[PDB]
Design a protein around this ligand. Structure first.
Ligand SMILES: CC(C)N(Cc1ccccc1OCCCCCC(=O)O)C(=O)c1ccc(-c2ccccc2)cc1
Ligand SMILES: CCCCCCCO[C@@H]1O[C@H](CO)[C@@H](O)[C@H](O)[C@H]1O
Ligand SMILES: [K+]
Length: 265
Protein backbone atom coordinates (compact mmCIF):
# COMPACT_ATOMS: atom_id res chain seq x y z
CA UNK A 1 0.00 0.00 0.00
CA UNK A 2 1.52 3.28 -1.21
CA UNK A 3 0.84 5.57 1.74
CA UNK A 4 1.50 8.87 -0.03
CA UNK A 5 -0.93 7.98 -2.82
CA UNK A 6 -3.46 6.65 -0.29
CA UNK A 7 -3.35 9.86 1.74
CA UNK A 8 -3.76 12.01 -1.36
CA UNK A 9 -6.78 9.95 -2.49
CA UNK A 10 -8.48 10.36 0.90
CA UNK A 11 -7.67 14.09 0.97
CA UNK A 12 -9.27 14.55 -2.46
CA UNK A 13 -12.34 12.57 -1.39
CA UNK A 14 -12.62 14.85 1.62
CA UNK A 15 -12.46 18.02 -0.50
CA UNK A 16 -15.01 16.53 -2.90
CA UNK A 17 -17.56 15.68 -0.21
CA UNK A 18 -17.26 18.46 2.42
CA UNK A 19 -17.95 21.95 1.03
CA UNK A 20 -16.93 23.69 4.26
CA UNK A 21 -13.28 22.90 4.98
CA UNK A 22 -11.14 24.10 7.85
CA UNK A 23 -9.18 26.24 5.37
CA UNK A 24 -12.36 28.05 4.27
CA UNK A 25 -13.69 28.34 7.82
CA UNK A 26 -10.45 29.87 9.11
CA UNK A 27 -10.36 32.37 6.27
CA UNK A 28 -13.84 33.55 7.40
CA UNK A 29 -13.20 33.43 11.14
CA UNK A 30 -10.05 35.55 10.78
CA UNK A 31 -11.19 37.86 7.97
CA UNK A 32 -17.58 38.99 3.78
CA UNK A 33 -18.06 38.80 7.57
CA UNK A 34 -20.63 36.46 9.10
CA UNK A 35 -23.84 37.77 10.58
CA UNK A 36 -23.68 37.30 14.35
CA UNK A 37 -26.55 35.37 15.97
CA UNK A 38 -26.60 35.94 19.72
CA UNK A 39 -30.30 36.32 20.73
CA UNK A 40 -33.86 35.83 19.49
CA UNK A 41 -33.94 38.99 17.41
CA UNK A 42 -30.74 38.19 15.54
CA UNK A 43 -31.78 34.57 15.05
CA UNK A 44 -35.06 35.77 13.52
CA UNK A 45 -33.19 38.21 11.25
CA UNK A 46 -30.84 35.39 10.21
CA UNK A 47 -33.72 33.07 9.35
CA UNK A 48 -35.14 35.82 7.15
CA UNK A 49 -31.86 37.03 5.65
CA UNK A 50 -29.38 34.16 5.38
CA UNK A 51 -29.51 31.24 2.94
CA UNK A 52 -29.97 27.93 4.77
CA UNK A 53 -29.61 24.44 3.27
CA UNK A 54 -32.77 23.26 5.03
CA UNK A 55 -35.58 25.75 4.48
CA UNK A 56 -37.35 26.75 7.69
CA UNK A 57 -40.82 25.80 6.42
CA UNK A 58 -39.51 22.22 6.43
CA UNK A 59 -38.76 22.27 10.16
CA UNK A 60 -41.43 21.65 12.78
CA UNK A 61 -43.51 24.71 13.62
CA UNK A 62 -41.68 27.13 15.89
CA UNK A 63 -42.48 26.81 19.61
CA UNK A 64 -39.42 28.08 21.47
CA UNK A 65 -35.88 29.19 20.69
CA UNK A 66 -34.11 26.27 22.41
CA UNK A 67 -36.02 23.65 20.40
CA UNK A 68 -35.68 25.56 17.16
CA UNK A 69 -31.91 25.66 17.73
CA UNK A 70 -31.98 21.90 18.39
CA UNK A 71 -33.80 21.35 15.08
CA UNK A 72 -31.17 23.40 13.22
CA UNK A 73 -28.49 21.27 14.92
CA UNK A 74 -30.32 18.09 13.84
CA UNK A 75 -30.59 19.37 10.26
CA UNK A 76 -26.87 19.89 9.99
CA UNK A 77 -26.12 16.58 11.71
CA UNK A 78 -28.21 14.62 9.19
CA UNK A 79 -26.68 16.52 6.28
CA UNK A 80 -23.20 15.70 7.55
CA UNK A 81 -24.14 12.01 7.84
CA UNK A 82 -25.00 12.18 4.12
CA UNK A 83 -21.59 13.68 3.32
CA UNK A 84 -19.76 11.16 5.52
CA UNK A 85 -21.56 8.29 3.75
CA UNK A 86 -20.36 9.54 0.36
CA UNK A 87 -16.87 10.23 1.74
CA UNK A 88 -16.59 6.70 3.13
CA UNK A 89 -17.80 5.17 -0.16
CA UNK A 90 -15.12 7.16 -1.98
CA UNK A 91 -12.70 4.75 -0.24
CA UNK A 92 -12.42 1.56 -2.34
CA UNK A 93 -11.78 -0.85 0.53
CA UNK A 94 -14.85 0.48 2.39
CA UNK A 95 -17.16 -0.01 -0.60
CA UNK A 96 -15.84 -3.61 -0.85
CA UNK A 97 -17.36 -4.42 2.55
CA UNK A 98 -20.85 -5.84 2.46
CA UNK A 99 -23.44 -3.11 2.84
CA UNK A 100 -24.41 -4.25 6.37
CA UNK A 101 -20.86 -3.68 7.65
CA UNK A 102 -20.81 -0.28 5.94
CA UNK A 103 -23.97 0.65 7.84
CA UNK A 104 -22.55 -0.64 11.13
CA UNK A 105 -19.42 1.48 10.72
CA UNK A 106 -21.38 4.61 9.88
CA UNK A 107 -23.93 3.98 12.65
CA UNK A 108 -21.27 3.90 15.34
CA UNK A 109 -18.77 6.30 13.73
CA UNK A 110 -20.63 9.29 12.24
CA UNK A 111 -21.06 11.27 15.47
CA UNK A 112 -17.39 10.76 16.41
CA UNK A 113 -16.47 12.09 12.96
CA UNK A 114 -18.99 14.95 13.20
CA UNK A 115 -17.64 16.12 16.58
CA UNK A 116 -14.04 15.98 15.29
CA UNK A 117 -14.98 18.00 12.16
CA UNK A 118 -16.90 20.51 14.30
CA UNK A 119 -13.65 22.03 15.58
CA UNK A 120 -12.95 23.21 12.03
CA UNK A 121 -15.82 25.76 12.24
CA UNK A 122 -15.44 26.64 15.94
CA UNK A 123 -13.51 29.12 17.96
CA UNK A 124 -13.76 29.80 21.69
CA UNK A 125 -16.53 32.35 21.07
CA UNK A 126 -18.89 30.47 18.73
CA UNK A 127 -19.23 28.64 15.45
CA UNK A 128 -20.09 29.19 11.81
CA UNK A 129 -23.54 28.31 10.50
CA UNK A 130 -25.36 28.71 7.17
CA UNK A 131 -22.34 27.72 5.06
CA UNK A 132 -20.22 30.38 6.78
CA UNK A 133 -22.65 33.28 6.42
CA UNK A 134 -23.64 33.23 10.10
CA UNK A 135 -21.78 32.96 13.40
CA UNK A 136 -23.67 31.74 16.48
CA UNK A 137 -22.13 32.75 19.80
CA UNK A 138 -21.22 30.20 22.42
CA UNK A 139 -22.77 32.44 25.11
CA UNK A 140 -26.10 32.36 23.25
CA UNK A 141 -25.96 28.56 23.07
CA UNK A 142 -25.17 28.46 26.80
CA UNK A 143 -28.30 30.55 27.39
CA UNK A 144 -30.69 27.93 26.03
CA UNK A 145 -32.79 26.12 28.56
CA UNK A 146 -31.81 22.77 29.93
CA UNK A 147 -31.37 20.17 28.52
CA UNK A 148 -30.34 21.77 25.23
CA UNK A 149 -27.55 23.98 26.60
CA UNK A 150 -26.07 20.91 28.27
CA UNK A 151 -25.82 18.92 25.02
CA UNK A 152 -23.91 21.74 23.29
CA UNK A 153 -21.18 22.95 25.64
CA UNK A 154 -19.12 19.68 25.93
CA UNK A 155 -18.58 19.74 22.17
CA UNK A 156 -17.03 23.22 22.41
CA UNK A 157 -14.77 22.05 25.23
CA UNK A 158 -13.54 19.19 23.07
CA UNK A 159 -13.21 21.32 19.95
CA UNK A 160 -11.11 24.11 21.45
CA UNK A 161 -8.65 21.54 22.77
CA UNK A 162 -8.63 19.69 19.46
CA UNK A 163 -7.85 22.92 17.59
CA UNK A 164 -4.71 23.34 19.71
CA UNK A 165 -3.22 20.44 17.67
CA UNK A 166 -3.38 22.69 14.57
CA UNK A 167 -4.43 19.98 12.12
CA UNK A 168 -5.17 20.96 8.55
CA UNK A 169 -7.71 19.45 6.16
CA UNK A 170 -5.22 16.91 4.73
CA UNK A 171 -4.66 15.58 8.28
CA UNK A 172 -8.35 15.61 9.12
CA UNK A 173 -9.22 13.57 6.04
CA UNK A 174 -7.12 10.68 7.33
CA UNK A 175 -8.26 11.14 10.92
CA UNK A 176 -11.95 10.98 9.92
CA UNK A 177 -11.28 7.92 7.74
CA UNK A 178 -9.66 6.22 10.75
CA UNK A 179 -12.70 6.97 12.93
CA UNK A 180 -15.11 5.39 10.46
CA UNK A 181 -12.95 2.34 9.69
CA UNK A 182 -13.00 1.08 13.25
CA UNK A 183 -12.84 -2.65 13.92
CA UNK A 184 -14.28 -2.30 17.44
CA UNK A 185 -17.89 -1.48 16.46
CA UNK A 186 -20.61 -3.79 17.84
CA UNK A 187 -22.02 -6.36 15.46
CA UNK A 188 -19.39 -6.02 12.75
CA UNK A 189 -19.32 -9.07 10.49
CA UNK A 190 -15.85 -8.92 8.90
CA UNK A 191 -13.75 -7.64 11.80
CA UNK A 192 -10.34 -8.68 10.37
CA UNK A 193 -10.96 -6.86 7.10
CA UNK A 194 -12.04 -3.66 8.85
CA UNK A 195 -9.06 -3.89 11.24
CA UNK A 196 -6.73 -4.25 8.24
CA UNK A 197 -8.15 -1.19 6.49
CA UNK A 198 -7.98 0.79 9.71
CA UNK A 199 -4.36 -0.19 10.15
CA UNK A 200 -3.47 1.06 6.65
CA UNK A 201 -5.22 4.38 7.37
CA UNK A 202 -3.32 4.73 10.67
CA UNK A 203 0.01 4.01 8.94
CA UNK A 204 -0.89 6.60 6.32
CA UNK A 205 -1.78 9.08 9.06
CA UNK A 206 1.57 8.68 10.78
CA UNK A 207 3.43 8.94 7.46
CA UNK A 208 1.46 12.03 6.48
CA UNK A 209 1.99 13.80 9.82
CA UNK A 210 5.73 13.15 9.62
CA UNK A 211 5.81 15.03 6.33
CA UNK A 212 3.24 17.70 7.15
CA UNK A 213 4.13 18.41 10.82
CA UNK A 214 7.87 17.71 11.02
CA UNK A 215 8.34 19.68 14.25
CA UNK A 216 5.31 18.39 16.16
CA UNK A 217 5.92 16.48 19.38
CA UNK A 218 3.91 13.33 19.82
CA UNK A 219 1.14 14.38 17.41
CA UNK A 220 0.35 10.86 16.22
CA UNK A 221 -0.13 9.36 19.72
CA UNK A 222 -1.98 12.56 20.70
CA UNK A 223 -4.49 11.85 17.91
CA UNK A 224 -4.90 8.20 18.91
CA UNK A 225 -5.91 9.49 22.32
CA UNK A 226 -8.36 11.96 20.71
CA UNK A 227 -10.05 8.98 19.02
CA UNK A 228 -10.57 7.41 22.45
CA UNK A 229 -11.80 10.75 23.80
CA UNK A 230 -14.40 11.03 21.01
CA UNK A 231 -15.82 7.62 21.92
CA UNK A 232 -16.52 8.94 25.41
CA UNK A 233 -17.95 12.21 24.06
CA UNK A 234 -20.41 10.30 21.87
CA UNK A 235 -21.35 7.88 24.67
CA UNK A 236 -22.33 10.85 26.78
CA UNK A 237 -24.07 12.50 23.84
CA UNK A 238 -26.20 9.44 23.16
CA UNK A 239 -27.12 9.23 26.83
CA UNK A 240 -28.26 12.86 26.75
CA UNK A 241 -30.29 12.29 23.56
CA UNK A 242 -32.05 9.28 25.07
CA UNK A 243 -32.96 11.47 28.04
CA UNK A 244 -34.32 14.20 25.71
CA UNK A 245 -36.51 11.49 24.18
CA UNK A 246 -37.97 10.67 27.60
CA UNK A 247 -38.37 14.16 29.09
CA UNK A 248 -38.96 16.38 26.02
CA UNK A 249 -41.74 14.39 24.37
CA UNK A 250 -42.90 17.31 22.16
CA UNK A 251 -39.48 17.69 20.53
CA UNK A 252 -39.12 15.91 17.21
CA UNK A 253 -36.18 13.56 16.71
CA UNK A 254 -35.19 12.77 13.13
CA UNK A 255 -35.84 9.05 12.45
CA UNK A 256 -32.33 8.51 11.10
CA UNK A 257 -30.83 9.72 14.37
CA UNK A 258 -33.35 7.52 16.22
CA UNK A 259 -31.99 4.52 14.30
CA UNK A 260 -28.41 5.58 15.06
CA UNK A 261 -29.09 5.76 18.82
CA UNK A 262 -31.21 2.55 19.01
CA UNK A 263 -29.27 -0.06 21.00
CA UNK A 264 -26.59 2.39 22.19
CA UNK A 265 -25.92 2.49 25.94
C1 LIG B 1 -23.45 19.40 13.34
C2 LIG B 1 -22.72 20.24 14.37
C3 LIG B 1 -22.16 19.36 15.49
N1 LIG B 1 -23.67 21.29 14.79
C4 LIG B 1 -24.48 20.99 15.97
C5 LIG B 1 -23.76 21.21 17.28
C6 LIG B 1 -22.65 22.03 17.37
C7 LIG B 1 -22.00 22.19 18.59
C8 LIG B 1 -22.49 21.54 19.71
C9 LIG B 1 -23.59 20.71 19.62
C10 LIG B 1 -24.24 20.56 18.39
O1 LIG B 1 -25.34 19.77 18.25
C11 LIG B 1 -25.90 19.13 19.40
C12 LIG B 1 -27.25 18.53 19.08
C13 LIG B 1 -27.15 17.51 17.96
C14 LIG B 1 -28.47 16.77 17.88
C15 LIG B 1 -28.54 15.85 16.68
C16 LIG B 1 -28.23 14.46 17.17
O2 LIG B 1 -27.02 14.17 17.22
O3 LIG B 1 -29.16 13.69 17.52
C17 LIG B 1 -23.75 22.39 14.04
O4 LIG B 1 -22.99 22.59 13.08
C18 LIG B 1 -24.75 23.51 14.28
C19 LIG B 1 -25.74 23.77 13.35
C20 LIG B 1 -26.65 24.82 13.57
C21 LIG B 1 -26.55 25.60 14.72
C22 LIG B 1 -27.47 26.76 14.94
C23 LIG B 1 -27.64 27.27 16.23
C24 LIG B 1 -28.47 28.37 16.42
C25 LIG B 1 -29.07 28.96 15.33
C26 LIG B 1 -28.89 28.50 14.04
C27 LIG B 1 -28.05 27.38 13.84
C28 LIG B 1 -25.54 25.35 15.63
C29 LIG B 1 -24.64 24.30 15.42
C1 LIG C 1 -26.71 6.66 6.65
C2 LIG C 1 -25.58 5.94 7.39
C3 LIG C 1 -25.89 5.87 8.89
C4 LIG C 1 -26.94 4.77 9.12
C5 LIG C 1 -27.26 4.81 10.61
C6 LIG C 1 -28.57 4.07 10.93
C7 LIG C 1 -28.29 2.58 11.17
O1 LIG C 1 -29.41 2.00 11.86
C8 LIG C 1 -29.49 0.62 11.81
O2 LIG C 1 -30.01 0.24 10.49
C9 LIG C 1 -30.15 -1.20 10.34
C10 LIG C 1 -30.78 -1.44 9.01
O3 LIG C 1 -29.76 -1.25 8.07
C11 LIG C 1 -30.98 -1.85 11.44
O4 LIG C 1 -30.79 -3.26 11.30
C12 LIG C 1 -30.58 -1.40 12.80
O5 LIG C 1 -31.61 -1.79 13.75
C13 LIG C 1 -30.40 0.08 12.90
O6 LIG C 1 -29.84 0.38 14.19
K1 LIG D 1 -10.35 27.21 18.88
Amino acid sequence: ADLKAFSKHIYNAYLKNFNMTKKKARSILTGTAPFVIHDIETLWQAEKGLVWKQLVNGLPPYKEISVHVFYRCQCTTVETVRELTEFAKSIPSFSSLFLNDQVTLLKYGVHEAIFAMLASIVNKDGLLVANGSGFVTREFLRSLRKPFSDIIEPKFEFAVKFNALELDDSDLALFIAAIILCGDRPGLMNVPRVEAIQDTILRALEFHLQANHPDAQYLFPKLLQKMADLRQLVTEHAQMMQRIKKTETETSLHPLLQEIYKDMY
